[PDB]
Each structure stands twice: as C-alpha cells, then as structure tokens.
C-alpha cells in the first residue's frame, strides 16, 4: 500500500491499540470492527478474528488487520 492509505487504516489501529503494543485483540477488534461497519454480535466476532487468526490466538498483527481494512474494498462483493 501507500504510506497515506496505510495512515487511515493505522490511524484506526493506534486508536483501537488499547492493550498497547502495536498488536490488536479480539477484545478490541469488537470496536475495531465496528468503525469498520460489520454485524457480527459477541458469537461471530470473536470467531470472526479466529478465523483469519495467526499463531497466538486471540491477538494479530497490523498486517493482518490490513488485509481486512483492505477486504471489504477488495472483495467488495
């Protein structure tokens, strides 16, 4: 990506980084993907991010939050 399209999705990701450490949880996704715009309620969306989860379950990585911020404009269909 560009750094300024980077930007709108990190901007996102400083914010929702509560648990502090540039890596995000599935208790923080739920306000993470709300700004996003999904309607998953508590059963899908922490299955939500297992889905796609890496190797440690529960937290991810900002690249992996980027593939989402950029799936729903992707796969926009």
Do not use: C, W
Request: glycine share 6%.
């Amino acid at each position: 990506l560009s750094e300024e399209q980077k930007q709108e999705i990190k901007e996102a990701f400083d914010l929702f980084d509560t648990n502090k450490t540039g890596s995000i949880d599935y208790h923080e996704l739920k306000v993470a993907m709300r700004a996003l715009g999904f309607d998953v309620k508590k059963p899908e969306i922490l299955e939500l991010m297992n889905e796609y989860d890496r190797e440690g379950n529960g937290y991810i990585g900002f690249d992996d939050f980027l593939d989402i911020m950029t799936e729903k404009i992707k796969n926009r269909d």
